[PDB]
Amino acid sequence: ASVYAWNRKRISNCVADYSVLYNSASFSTFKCYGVSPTKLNDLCFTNVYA
Amino acid sequence: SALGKLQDVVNQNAQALNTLVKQLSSNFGAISSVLNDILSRLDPPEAEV
Numbered sequence: 001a002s003v004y005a006w007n008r009k010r011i012s013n014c015v016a017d018y019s020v021l022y023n024s025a026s027f028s029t030f031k032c033y034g035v036s037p038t039k040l041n042d043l044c045f046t047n048v049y050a
Numbered sequence: 051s052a053l054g055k056l057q058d059v060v061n062q063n064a065q066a067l068n069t070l071v072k073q074l075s076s077n078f079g080a081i082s083s084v085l086n087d088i089l090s091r092l093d094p095p096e097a098e099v
Contacts, residue, residue, distance in 0.1 A: 034081060036093045043091055 011048035016041075 001007045018040045021030070030037060051057075077083050081092075088097055 035091045036096070038093075039091055 007050075009050040011050060016045070016048070 021027070021037075021040070035043065075083050080088065082088050
C-alpha cells in the first residue's frame with residue numbers, strides 16, 4: 001500500500017518463525033532497535049504489528 | 051504502643067530493607083529493570099550500555 005495509508009497486520013497467538021528474515025536475499029536494510037536481530041527466535045512477545 | 055522506641059527501630063530497618071529491594075525494579079534509564087531480559091534480547095555491545 002501507499003505510505004500515507006500503510007497496511008497494519010496484527011500478529012498474535014502464533015509460533016513466531018523468523019526464518020524468512022534470515023533466508024531472504026532481497027533485504028537491503030535490516031535495522032533493529034531495542035532487540036538483537038539474531039535473537040528474535042529466543043524471545044516471547046505480547047503482540048506484534050507488521 | 052508502649053514500646054514505640056523499640057518498634058521504631060524494627061520499622062525503620064524493615065522500611066530501609068524494603069526500599070532496597072524495591073529499587074531492583076527500577077530501570078534507571080535502561081530498557082528493562084531485569085538483567086536477564088537485557089541479556090536475552092541484546093548483543094554484548096548494546097547490552098553493556
